[PDB]
């Protein structure tokens, strides 16, 4: 089996991308943020406290003939931004882009934090990291990818995120029309449960490539590219109005700048992020200051190749017994 689904940015900044997923019987369509940085599939539901629901589409398990309560099981998760949710757990059929999994654990939110209530476009998250990070207790549940792998034509799923434009998430096949050249694969470490890999270096603009090892994670659910402080300082040093701003929380620069590109290594290959993708957006509508798309990871603790980097490439999450991460230009 395979599936293929359109993923669309939630706003004109590409802050995040949603992908419709059909849950239950008959199917209830919810738009989820596919998150390779976590391993829970959770949704707003008929169980979520009413005052914490502000525009989202809820799953109602009592209307699904295939839903089953997983007795005794509860979950609680917090994310890097401080947001959180918790609740209980059903299994149900879940389909993405025509690929159906039966008995997928669907985590039903009894409570969600303020940031999720204010995000009207995101109905829940679909976690695609390794199932060791899943937060269901007492027994952890597999992600939708792990449950699909027995039926997939190939144990793989690709992310092709667009720049201010829709993209695609494919499961089970590699679309050779979707990228140019060849894919370079690199080793993944699953010791922390993440799609964790080591970039071989970087260059800014038309400058020299510096070989230096950058361990980071590929996270579709983080917007920006967070790199070590001295690498990010080398980048902004090439942009004449750029400065670090404590008030806004990162490097800002005049919107009227043309920004250099940023290249990162994958083994012997090079991925180039166009300058325009790094120009994330004005800090306020009508501002002449813009927020940059590469920021320091020092405060985070880990380096994160978020959507600004992944949307410059076609990325293959190879979930064979020894996983790997493939990157091609597109």
């Amino acid at each position: 089996s395979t599936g293929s689904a359109t993923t669309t940015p939630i706003d004109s900044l590409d802050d995040a991308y949603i992908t419709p997923v059909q849950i239950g019987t008959p199917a209830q369509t919810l738009n989820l943020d596919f998150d390779t940085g976590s391993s829970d599939l959770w949704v707003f539901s008929s169980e979520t406290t009413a005052s914490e629901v502000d525009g989202q589409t809820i799953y109602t398990p009592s209307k699904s003939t295939t839903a089953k309560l997983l007795s005794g099981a509860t979950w609680s998760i917090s994310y890097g931004d401080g947001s959180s949710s918790s609740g209980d757990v059903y299994t149900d059929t879940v389909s993405v882009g025509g690929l159906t999994v039966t008995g997928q654990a669907v985590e039903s939110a009894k409570k969600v934090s303020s940031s999720f209530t204010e995000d009207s476009t995101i109905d829940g998250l679909l976690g695609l990291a390794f199932s060791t990070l899943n937060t269901v207790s007492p027994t952890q549940q597999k992600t939708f990818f792990d449950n699909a792998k027995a039926s997939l034509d190939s144990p793989v799923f690709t992310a092709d995120l667009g720049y201010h434009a829709p993209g695609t998430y494919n499961f089970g096949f590699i679309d050779t029309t979707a990228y140019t050249g060849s894919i370079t694969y690199t080793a993944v470490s699953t010791k922390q449960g993440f799609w964790e890999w080591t970039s071989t270096g970087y260059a800014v603009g038309s400058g020299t490539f510096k070989s230096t090892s950058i361990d980071g994670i590929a996270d579709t659910g983080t917007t920006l590219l967070y790199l070590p402080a001295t690498v990010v300082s080398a980048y902004w040093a090439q942009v004449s109005g750029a400065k670090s701003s404590s008030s806004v929380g990162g490097y800002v620069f005049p919107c009227s700048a043309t920004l250099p590109s940023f290249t990162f290594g994958v083994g012997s290959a090079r991925i180039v992020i166009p300058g325009d993708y790094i120009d994330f957006g004005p800090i306020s509508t009508g501002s002449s200051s813009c927020f940059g798309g590469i920021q320091s990871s020092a405060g985070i603790g880990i380096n994160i190749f978020g959507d600004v980097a992944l949307k410059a490439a076609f990325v293959v999450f190879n979930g064979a017994t020894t996983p790997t991460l493939g990157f091609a230009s597109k």
Binding site: A16, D33, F34, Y79, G80, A129
Partner: peptide, 7 residues
């Protein structure tokens, strides 16, 4: 309005 998704 960037997002930063487990901790």
């Amino acid at each position: 309005h960037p997002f930063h998704x487990i901790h």
